[PDB]
Every structure is written in structure tokens, then in C-alpha cells.
Amino acid sequence: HWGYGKHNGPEHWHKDFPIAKGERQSPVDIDTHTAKYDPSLKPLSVSYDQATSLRILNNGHAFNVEFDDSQDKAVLKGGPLDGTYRLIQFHFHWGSLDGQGSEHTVDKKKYAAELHLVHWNTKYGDFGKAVQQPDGLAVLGIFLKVGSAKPGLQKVVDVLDSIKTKGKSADFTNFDPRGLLPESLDYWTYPGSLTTPPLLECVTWIVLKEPISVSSEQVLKFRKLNFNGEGEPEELMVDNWRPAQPLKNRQIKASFK
Numbered sequence: 001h002w003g004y005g006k007h008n009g010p011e012h013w014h015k016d017f018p019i020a021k022g023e024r025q026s027p028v029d030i031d032t033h034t035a036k037y038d039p040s041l042k043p044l045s046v047s048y049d050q051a052t053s054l055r056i057l058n059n060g061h062a063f064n065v066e067f068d069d070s071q072d073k074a075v076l077k078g079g080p081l082d083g084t085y086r087l088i089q090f091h092f093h094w095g096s097l098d099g100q101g102s103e104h105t106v107d108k109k110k111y112a113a114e115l116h117l118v119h120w121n122t123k124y125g126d127f128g129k130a131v132q133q134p135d136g137l138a139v140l141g142i143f144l145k146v147g148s149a150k151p152g153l154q155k156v157v158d159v160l161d162s163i164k165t166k167g168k169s170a171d172f173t174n175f176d177p178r179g180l181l182p183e184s185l186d187y188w189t190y191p192g193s194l195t196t197p198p199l200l201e202c203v204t205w206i207v208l209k210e211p212i213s214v215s216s217e218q219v220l221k222f223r224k225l226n227f228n229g230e231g232e233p234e235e236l237m238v239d240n241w242r243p244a245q246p247l248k249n250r251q252i253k254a255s256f257k
């Protein structure tokens with residue numbers, strides 16, 4: 001099925017998922033000199049104190065840290081959003097080398113990786129019905145650069161040895177996603193899509209301007225994961241990023257002057 005190799009990578013995905021060539025695909029390049037400050041934006045509220053992580057899963061494309069979304073426990077509100085969006089999972093995209101790995105770019109700059117915290121609009125009752133809606137989802141996107149270690153990431157790095165291959169999962173309780181956030185919540189926002197199949201056009205993207213720094217050793221451990229299942233030839237899980245897609249008839253708005 002789909003992946004990130006020569007034969008099944010992002011340029012192929014449109015054959016099984018025609019929305020790949022849609023009007024509101026993600027990611028995009030964020031041209032900082034075309035994005036405009038929007039005074040109509042309310043302050044962004046990241047309310048993660050009651051977050052309940054459950055498990056971490058290698059799905060043969062990335063790894064997901066999954067949360068209990070059965071109540072309003074870890075929510076995103078404010079900014080461009082109308083109402084309350086509940087955190088369901090996060091995951092990353094990364095490169096084989098530090099010069100690439102992000103999906104959004106900033107003035108064509110690629111970061112070493114990118115974190116996506118996925119949330120769904122509680123007015124639609126659950127995630128499945130949220131992805132039938134143009135405002136069903138909000139993804140908080142955070143760039144990673146290589147520099148100092150991120151201590152709030154090390155519990156993730158240390159569990160990766162136990163979910164090396166596709167279909168492996170591990171308990172992952174009591175993980176605090178606050179430890180993944182940069183100091184500033186300045187952001188760009190635009191209407192887009194999920195960046196993996198099914199590529200659904202439901203997402204209000206909120207992409208933080210300030211990257212987090214992780215260490216070379218941390219990112220190196222991401223690169224030891226496998227796309228393949230146990231007992232299959234090793235294909236290292238690297239370069240699991242979709243490139244920038246056409247902006248089409250969209251505007252990117254900045255939360256800051």
C-alpha cells in the first residue's frame with residue numbers, strides 16, 4: 001500500500017487517493033512575507049494538564065502516541081478555532097539527514113523533523129464523524145531542529161527500541177505532551193488536510209514559529225525504527241515526510257506582528 005519509497009511514495013498517492021491533488025492539501029511552504037498578521041485571532045489556549053497518554057504504536061509509517069479522548073482532558077482552543085478540539089494522538093515526520101524531514105517549510109527551509117498533535121472538534125462527537133467535516137480537525141505543528149537535547153522527549157526516544165517494527169505497540173502512560181512545546185505560541189494558520197492517506201481536507205493547521213531543539217542522538221534513535229514488520233527485510237523509517245503542496249486559493253495568517 002502507500003508509503004515513502006520510490007515505488008509507493010507521495011507522487012503515487014493520488015492514484016488510490018485522488019484528493020491528493022485537491023484544493024486544500026497539506027503541507028505547504030509558509031512564505032513569511034506573504035503571511036499577514038490577523039488581529040481577529042483570539043489568543044491560542046493549549047490546555048494539556050489533564051492529558052492521559054495510553055500507548056505508543058509503530059504503524060509502519062510513523063509512531064503514534066495515543067491519548068484517552070473519551071472526555072475533555074487535553075484540549076486546544078482559541079486562535080482561529082471555534083469551540084474545543086480534543087487531543088487524540090501525536091506523531092512525527094523526520095529525515096534521513098538533519099537537512100530535511102519537516103513537511104511544512106518556512107521560506108523553503110526544511111527542518112530536521114516535525115511534530116503533529118492531532119485534535120478533533122468536539123461538536124462532531126468523535127474523530128470518525130469529525131473527518132467528514134471541513135472544520136473537523138486541528139493539527140498543532142511544531143518544528144524540530146538539531147541542537148540541545150529536549151528532555152521532555154527522552155521518554156519517547158527510550159521506548160522506541162520496544163516498537164521497532166510495524167504493528168508493535170507498548171504501554172505509554174503518564175507522558176506529558178507539555179514537554180514538547182516551545183516557549184512561544186506565535187503561529188501561522190491556514191486550512192489544509194491530513195498529510196498521510198486518506199489526505200482528508202478537514203484540518204485547521206496551526207504551525208508554531210519557534211522550533212524545539214532536539215539532540216543529534218535523539219533524532220538518530222528515531223532513524224533506527226523500521227517501516228517493515230518483524231521478520232521482514234529492514235527498511236529504516238526515515239524520510240516519512242510529504243513535500244509541500246500547492247497553496248491554491250488559500251491565505252496563511254500570522255498570530256504575531
Ligand SMILES: [Zn+2]
Pocket residue numbers: 091092093116195
Ligand atoms: Zn503528520
